[PDB]
């Protein structure tokens, strides 16, 4: 075995967790987009109906 010391092992684990968090941020951004767009569509329909009225 050629493991690095424990102190830097913590940093190695942090780097792997950083990769996972990097993926998670993009996932949340796509979530925000998919959430926000339908609300815009609904507001557009609402203002169109208000104009008709």
């Amino acid at each position: 075995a050629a493991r690095p010391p424990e102190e830097v092992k913590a940093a190695f684990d942090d780097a792997i967790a950083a990769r996972e968090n990097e993926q998670q941020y993009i996932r949340e951004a796509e979530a925000y987009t998919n959430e926000v767009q339908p609300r815009a569509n609904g507001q557009a329909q609402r203002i169109l109906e208000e104009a008709r009225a």
């Binding site: 684990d13 792997i16 967790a17 996972e20």
Partner: peptide
């Protein structure tokens, strides 16, 4: 019919099967 000294055949041992039971991640990665 030469037997390498670092082989298990140099000893009286024969390995018939090697398998992995479970592969886990460190608790931070998990």
């Amino acid at each position: 019919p030469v037997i390498n000294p670092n082989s298990m055949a140099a000893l009286g041992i024969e390995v018939v099967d090697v398998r992995i039971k479970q592969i886990n991640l460190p608790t931070e990665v998990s």
